[PDB]
Amino acid sequence: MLEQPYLDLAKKVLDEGHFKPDRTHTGTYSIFGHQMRFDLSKGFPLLTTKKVPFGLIKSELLWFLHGDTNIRFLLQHRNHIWDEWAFEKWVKSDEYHGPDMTDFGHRSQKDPEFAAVYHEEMAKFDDRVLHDDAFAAKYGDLGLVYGSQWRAWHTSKGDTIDQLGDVIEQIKTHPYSRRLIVSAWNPEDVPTMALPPCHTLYQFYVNDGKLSLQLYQRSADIFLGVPFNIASYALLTHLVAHECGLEVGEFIHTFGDAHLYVNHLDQIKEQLSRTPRPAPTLQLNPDKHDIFDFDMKDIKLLNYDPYPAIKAPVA
Amino acid sequence: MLEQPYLDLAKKVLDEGHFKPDRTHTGTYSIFGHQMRFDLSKGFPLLTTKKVPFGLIKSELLWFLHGDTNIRFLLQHRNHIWDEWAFEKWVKSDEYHGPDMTDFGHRSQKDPEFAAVYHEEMAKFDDRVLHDDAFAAKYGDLGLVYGSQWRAWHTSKGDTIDQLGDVIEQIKTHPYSRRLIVSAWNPEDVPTMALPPCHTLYQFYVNDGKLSLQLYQRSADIFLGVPFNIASYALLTHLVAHECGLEVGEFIHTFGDAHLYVNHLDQIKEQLSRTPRPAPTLQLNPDKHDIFDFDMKDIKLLNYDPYPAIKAPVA
C-alpha cells in the first residue's frame, strides 16, 4: 500500500528507538539514519491513516516556490504554520507593550487562560500583519525561511542566487546531472538563527525520462511532522516533473535523526491499528506550466478518503 | 562479515543498475539512493577483498584535518591523489611553455608516449611544488578542497569559520544535538569550480556514549572510489570519538547516485568471487589527543591481510 514505509518507520522507532533526554529533557525515541521510498506512479503519499490537511501543504509549498518569506501570504490562505515564529520576534521589543510571553509555547501548554491571552494577542498580530503594510513588512517578513534560501541565497559578493530556478534550468538541459542539488543549509546563518533547517539538502535525478527526488532531513517528528513533509516534497517532485516536461518517478525520504516524542506514542499506537486505503491521485493544470506562477487552484488532489485525524499535543 | 554492505552495493548496481550515457558518454550503471551501515565495534571497514592503501587514506585525512589545501603536504607523503587537479591549473598559462595537454586524462588513457610526456612533466611539477616555496604557494595550493571548507568556510562578512572545530566543540558540550553537521557544499563556489564535492554533507550523533557518523555522498564510484571513502570517514569517526572521549559506534554511508563505470564490471565481477577475511583493528595513540595535531605515526592499523589488489583503469 503506498504509505506503508511511513508506518514501518514508526514501528521501527517504537520498538528500536532510544531514549534521549533532549528537549527541556521532556523524551523521545530516536533512530539515526533511515531511507524510505515512495513510487509516485502508484499515488500521492498523503497519509490515508489519519486525515492530513493537503491545503496547508499546497499553500506552504506555494510560498516556498514564490520565493516568499513574509507571513502575510500564508495568513491570506488560513495558513498558520509559521505564525509562531514571527509573533515571537514581534513580542521582542517595541509597539509590544503587552504581556511579555517568555516560553509561551509551554506557558500557553501548561496553562488555562495564559491560551486566551496568547490567542487574542495572536488574533491581533495576525490581523496586523494582514492590513498594516508597514507592519507586515517589518514583523511578518521572517527573512531566512526555505523560500528565501531556495530562490535567493545571499552570496558573499552581494548578489542573490535563485538556486532552485537554476537547478530547474539544468533539469531541462542537463537531465543526467549528478549535481541537481539545492541546499537550504547556510554555514554562517545556521548558528545566529532559530531553526537551522530540517529539510537540509535535496537532489533530483533523471533516468527513463522520469524525475525522482531525494530529501536529507535532519530531524523529524514521526507523528506530527513526517506525514505533512512527505506531501510537500512529493508535490515538489510532481510540479518540477510537470514543468521540465517529464514524468514522476520516485520520492526517497532520508532521515538523519527520526524521532517520536513520548506524548505521541498513544496516538501513533492507535493509528497503526488502522488499514491504509487506496491513496489520492494528485492532478495539476496542463494549461499552466509556469510552476512559480502557480496558485492554489491549479494543483488539485482527488480521492483522499482518510480515516479520522488523531489529535495529539505537540511536545 | 564487516565489509559485506559494500559487496552487496555492487551486486545491486550490477543487476539493478541503469545505463546512463553521461561522461563523454563512455557508460555507467547507476542507482539513486542507498544507505549502507558499518558497526565500527566489529572492525575497521577497509576492504579485505582487494588490497587498498590505508596510508594514502590516513595521509589524505590528515591534510583535511590540518585545514590544508596545498599539494605539498601530500607530496611529502608519496600521496598523489590530488596532483591532477593542481597540475591542470599549472599547465593553464605562464612558466608553462611546454606541450599543451588538453584532455591529458584521455590523451595520456588513449596514448602511448603522450603517458611519458605527462609523466616527466608531472615528475617535474611535483618537484616544483616540493622545493619552490614561491611556486608551491601559487600552484600547489588548490584553495577550495575539503580541508579548506571544513576548517575555514569563507563567510560573506570577511571571516573564516572552522566549522569542524566548532562541531567538535559541540560534541563535548552538546552531545545530544541534532545539528552536529559539517557541510562542504557552497552554493556560490559550486558552479565556478572543477569538483563540487561528492562528500557533500556529514552529521555526527551520540547515544549510549558512542559516536556514530553519517555521510551524504552525491556521486560515487563503486569500484575505484567507495573502498577508499569508507575508510576516510571510518577513520574520522574513530578520531572524533577518540578526542571527545567517547566510543565508536557506527558509520552510515548514504549515497545519492552510486555507479560503477562499464570498464570496471570485470574486476568487480572477479572481486565478488572472493571471501571477505576478519577485518583489521584500527588503533590510535592515547598519549595524544589533539586530533588536528595528529600525524601519520599515531594512527596505526593492524591485521589487514587482504586478497591481491585488482587493477582497473579509471574511466
Swiss-Prot record, chains A, B:
PROSITE patterns: THYMIDYLATE_SYNTHASE (PS00091). GO terms for molecular function: thymidylate synthase activity. It catalyses: dUMP + (6R)-5,10-methylene-5,6,7,8-tetrahydrofolate = 7,8-dihydrofolate + dTMP. DUMP binds at R23, R178, R179, R218, S219, A220, D221, N229, H259, L260, Y261. Pathway: Pyrimidine metabolism; dTTP biosynthesis. InterPro entries: Thymidate_synth/dCMP_Mease (IPR045097), Thymidate_synth/dCMP_Mease_dom (IPR023451), Thymidate_synth/dCMP_Mease_sf (IPR036926), Thymidylate_synthase (IPR000398), Thymidylate_synthase_AS (IPR020940). It is an enzyme of class 2 (transferase). The active site is at C198. (6R)-5,10-methylene-5,6,7,8-tetrahydrofolate binds at D221, A315. Keywords: Cytoplasm, Methyltransferase, Nucleotide biosynthesis, Transferase. One of its GO terms (cellular component) is cytosol. Its EC number is 2.1.1.45. Signal peptide: none annotated. It is found in: Cytoplasm. Pfam families: Thymidylat_synt (PF00303). One of its GO terms (biological process) is methylation. Coiled coil: none annotated. HAMAP family: Thymidy_synth_bact. Catalyzes the reductive methylation of 2'-deoxyuridine-5'-monophosphate (dUMP) to 2'-deoxythymidine-5'-monophosphate (dTMP) while utilizing 5,10-methylenetetrahydrofolate (mTHF) as the methyl donor and reductant in the reaction, yielding dihydrofolate (DHF) as a by-product. This enzymatic reaction provides an intracellular de novo source of dTMP, an essential precursor for DNA biosynthesis. Homodimer. Belongs to the thymidylate synthase family. Bacterial-type ThyA subfamily. This is Thymidylate synthase.
